Design a protein around this ligand. Structure first.
Ligand SMILES: CN(C)C(=O)c1cnn(C)c1C(=O)Nc1ccn2cc(-c3cccc(F)c3)nc2n1
Ligand SMILES: [Mg+2]
Ligand SMILES: [Zn+2]
Length: 313
């Protein structure tokens, strides 16, 4: 009740900024998350003991992979916290409850492999879930952990509020399938440009929450350049391991997954910023103007990748 989390001064100030890095002290990440829920949602949103038990079982269900790990979960949750805190009045009580949880859970039990690799390998998950294979798994793992004894952080919601928050979580997690982002952003672009975008329309809110999820999930590209550049190393460590696994199935991998083509990374990121990242943060800033610092940081990083290509670093 009277028990607040507090962070050291530098973290207390910098955690409010979009470009905050959660740091290398793994043991501080649970407290950072609880801090964010308490300011985002309230000290009454969750029972502390259940929330702490939930966080620790979520952590145990992330694997020791280079990029899709517990540090990514907490990093994606912080980007959502910064969006929510910069857009105080736009979101419901249930949305603030659901979205930080959705971000912490969004890659539960990730193995470091794409949906395509699972399908090419003929993994059992690819027979259970024919599209958004890993994302349906992540939602399945979230419900599993919510059903463990002492882990129902939503216990005080009515039946219909509980059903609504699990549906916010399910859609938010499915929306992190990047295959779905291209069409979602295009529809949001048309709706904003023709002035049909309506935040009282639930299917429009679902789209805007979806785009928030892509924006949070890709948030490596919105950090300060030394963070962006070092995170890219972990991202490619996974891509290249998947490429090795493609070659063991007798399949030439795409260039981004082939370690033999490491020298073209700079030109690859450049393509990714122009095709995905810039469009994403551009359309998010049109809908939610106070997210502009994500777009500005993305543009700063694109210019750094252009500098790498020119041999200026
Ligand atoms: C930074 N960030 C978030 C990510 O990179 C990120 C996070 N998840 N996903 C899925 C991505 C993603 O799609 N990134 C990409 C996309 C296309 N690419 C093409 C190349 C490439 C091409 C030729 C040679 C070469 F070496 C690399 N590199 C790429 N990286
Ligand atoms: Mg994912
Ligand atoms: Zn993710």
């Amino acid at each position: 009740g009277l028990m607040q989390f507090t962070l050291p001064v530098r973290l207390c100030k910098e955690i409010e900024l979009f470009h905050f890095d959660i740091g290398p002290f793994e043991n501080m990440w649970p407290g950072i998350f609880v801090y964010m829920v308490h300011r985002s949602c309230g000290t009454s949103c969750f029972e502390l003991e259940k929330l702490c038990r939930f966080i620790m079982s979520v952590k145990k269900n992330y694997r020791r992979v280079p990029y899709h790990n517990w540090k990514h979960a907490v990093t994606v949750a912080h980007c959502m916290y910064a969006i929510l805190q910069n857009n105080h009045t736009l979101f419901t009580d249930l949305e603030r409850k659901g979205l930080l949880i959705a971000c912490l859970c969004h890659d539960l039990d990730h193995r470091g492999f794409s949906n395509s690799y699972l399908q090419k390998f003929d993994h059992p998950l690819a027979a259970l879930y024919s599209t958004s294979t890993m994302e349906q798994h992540h939602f399945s793992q979230t419900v599993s952990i919510l059903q463990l004894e002492g882990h129902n952080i939503f216990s005080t919601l009515s039946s219909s509020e509980y059903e609504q928050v699990l549906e916010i979580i399910r859609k938010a997690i499915i929306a992190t399938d990047l295959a779905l982002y291209f069409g979602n952003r295009k529809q949001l672009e048309e709706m904003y440009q023709t002035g049909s975008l309506n935040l009282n329309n639930q299917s429009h809110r679902d789209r805007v929450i979806g785009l928030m999820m892509t924006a949070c999930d890709l948030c490596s590209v919105t950090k300060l350049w030394p963070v962006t550049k070092l995170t890219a190393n972990d991202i490619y460590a996974e891509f290249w391991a998947e490429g090795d696994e493609m070659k063991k199935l007798g399949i030439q991998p795409i260039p981004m997954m082939d370690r033999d083509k490491k020298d073209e990374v700079p030109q690859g990121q450049l393509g990714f910023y122009n095709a995905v990242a810039i469009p994403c943060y551009t359309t998010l800033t049109q809908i939610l103007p106070p997210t502009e610092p994500l777009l500005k940081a993305c543009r700063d990083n694109l210019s750094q990748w252009e500098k790498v290509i020119r041999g200026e670093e």
